[PDB]
Design a protein around this ligand. Structure first.
Ligand SMILES: CCCC(CCC)C(N)=O
Ligand SMILES: CCCC(CCC)C(N)=O
Lengths: 385, 385
């Protein structure tokens, strides 16, 4: 119960949450893994560079590991190693993990995941904080919500559409419910950066926003592409290849969410292939194979996929004007994330007072470079709060 | 044995082929249908208009029918009701159905299927010819090949890339093997129309081409989208919707064929969702539910999907110049196929000497409107041969 006490000004009741998947669901996962079939080998599945997606070799070995090496129980205990709670907001059950400080002056921060991630993405950073602070000295309140449609959060609604602004509104309400209406900071990557920008733009209690993703076109009023350094041009080139060769999954989520939702719900191996591809291609250094299995299993056991992808019709269907962040705005750049835009471009989308360049790390910043992201966020808060 | 005799000038021996799927394969299929999971209901899968893809209701109903009503054996007997053969070309096993005339002067025609179709698409046309003629009066040789990577054809190769031109080369060589080196005509729709175009462009034994698809953008020289009729502009808008809201599946096939191949091989429910969506959306009048079950089961049992999608790299990554059909060119227009372009546009892409416009019918012309397609084709052949 260390770090678990709600701040003094929270208005909601603490409802402690524990992950406890019944053995039957685990047995059924294994059964469905076993019954699943692998594609016959094809020219494309035999390409070791994986330019056409996951290889037969990888899927074959991952499937065997899932049946024989994988154990949910230690990962689950790890999920349960931090304080978690649920609360209801607009009739939605909203799950969140948290490290709450006992200091009255602690800066409230919400850290926002995306797809195919989750609240667990931030666990390595929570771990560093717990190794390095006590509840008495912890300088921040660290709130890690599950966004509507993900894992232990319910939703989105069945009877109406739901988008990025609805996600933002829920996050702000959580922060308000926990006692943070006088101010909070947002850390956001992936879909959480879209949500974080909206909080910065339109929500008075959001005082500052740090992002590790700024997906954007060339700014209308410049600077132009030719003003970019050779290295920044390499980044734009990587982004353009992502935008042309790497976005088909997102356009399927966007245009046919119901179809792909059913497709990936039918077999755990379908889900692994689709989500596994991104955990392979979107990082700098390869993740442990068990981490991929853990994340995919988490999605499977919570039926996350068909619920989570609603925002794709908004993210993958103004940054200088309507969605310009007037508040203190920070950015951490990791080169192997998918949209490596230059600082000069990012600077046009908000009041950029803080920028950190990194030599390594890909899309899953919190998982891949937890120290660098924690350090960057800490410096940002110390600068602007 | 009727209609099964190879022409006198064939250089290959007949190797008669029969579909015979073992009971164990059907048993495994049924079990995977039963134990594959369905997504929980979402806002998207509750949309009765299906704008987000297949609904929970449809998939649930189709699954119940697949388990309790579907029977592979009568469909299989139907496959086996026309002459079928295999021959080896470039180390590939090439399957084809056929009605061979005993008339020495019979016009050789190959009819080319696409995705998610197969040789059986042309069975209604073959039956109409069989009812109308005897082997001694049949005016055409009707060859219906299975393209590399589909159903009972093997391949494509595991050790090299394979594309549309390779498909054209295989078809042209099959026709030569069967004795038609002095000339043949091609009917093509879907991917078969891309292959059909390449045969008209680059293969001299191909004497004329009839297509029911001509996917293209506005021609440079004319006429402009402005001068088009109201009905033509409505067609342009349907095509434009297809290219923007309806193309994600193809972009996934194109960019990540290995991943989607494995996804859809993992569970027959996955395959049914992905392919069934297209059998629903691409037709004019709804097909019987059992037809979709039959088409999907045929893909499942032959592991067609991962092998067949190789051409998408080229079809979904010139028509007035390099790929202009200088040979007699014919076109059948069915309004609910996916790219309904004006006749004036089509005319810029070949020597268009034949055009038939239809009030009804969608993508799967041979299936949906067999009398119209057979009839258009006969008229075309008699005119140009
Ligand atoms: C919000 C959509 C962003 C993309 C990844 C690009 C960085 C995704 N998660 O599908
Ligand atoms: C070759 C791409 C054609 C499309 C349908 C549009 C007519 C398909 N079969 O994927």
């Amino acid at each position: 119960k260390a770090f678990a006490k709600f701040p003094s000004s929270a208005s909601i009741s603490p409802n402690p949450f524990t992950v406890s998947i019944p053995d039957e669901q685990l047995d059924d996962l294994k059964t469905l893994v076993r019954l699943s079939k692998i594609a016959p080998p094809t020219y494309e599945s035999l390409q070791a560079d994986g330019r056409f997606g996951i290889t037969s070799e990888w899927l074959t070995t991952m499937r065997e590991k899932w049946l024989s090496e994988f154990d949910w129980r230690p990962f689950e205990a790890r999920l349960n190693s931090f304080p978690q709670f649920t609360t209801e907001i607009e009739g939605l059950t909203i799950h969140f993990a948290a490290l709450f400080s006992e200091r009255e002056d602690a800066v409230p921060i919400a850290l926002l995941h995306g797809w195919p991630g989750s609240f667990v993405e931030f666990y390595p950073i929570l771990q560093l904080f717990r190794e390095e602070y006590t509840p008495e000295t912890l300088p921040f309140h660290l709130v890690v919500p599950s966004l509507p449609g993900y894992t232990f959060s319910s939703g989105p609604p069945l009877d109406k559409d739901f988008g990025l602004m609805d996600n933002a509104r829920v996050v702000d309400q959580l922060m308000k419910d926990l006692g943070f209406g006088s101010g909070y900071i947002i850390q956001g990557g992936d879909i959480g950066s879209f949500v974080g920008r909206l909080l910065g733009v339109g929500f008075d209690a959001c005082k500052a926003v740090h992002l590790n993703l700024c997906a954007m076109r060339a700014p209308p009023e410049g600077p132009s592409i030719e003003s970019l350094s050779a290295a920044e041009k390499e980044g734009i080139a990587r982004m353009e290849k992502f935008m042309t060769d790497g976005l088909a999954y997102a356009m399927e989520h966007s245009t046919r969410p119901s179809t792909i939702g059913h497709v990936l719900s039918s077999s755990p191996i379908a889900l692994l292939a689709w989500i596994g591809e991104k955990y392979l291609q979107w990082v700098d250094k390869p993740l442990p194979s068990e981490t991929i299995l853990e994340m995919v299993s988490l999605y499977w056991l919570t039926e996350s996929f068909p619920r989570a992808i609603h925002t794709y019709r908004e993210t993958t269907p103004m940054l200088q004007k309507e969605l310009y962040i007037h508040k203190p705005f920070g950015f951490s750049f990791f080169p192997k994330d998918l949209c490596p835009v230059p600082r000069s471009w990012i600077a046009t989308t908000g009041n950029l007072v803080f920028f950190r360049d990194h030599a390594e790390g890909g899309h899953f910043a919190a998982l891949e470079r937890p120290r660098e992201l924690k350090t960057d966020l800490t410096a940002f808060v110390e600068q602007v709060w």
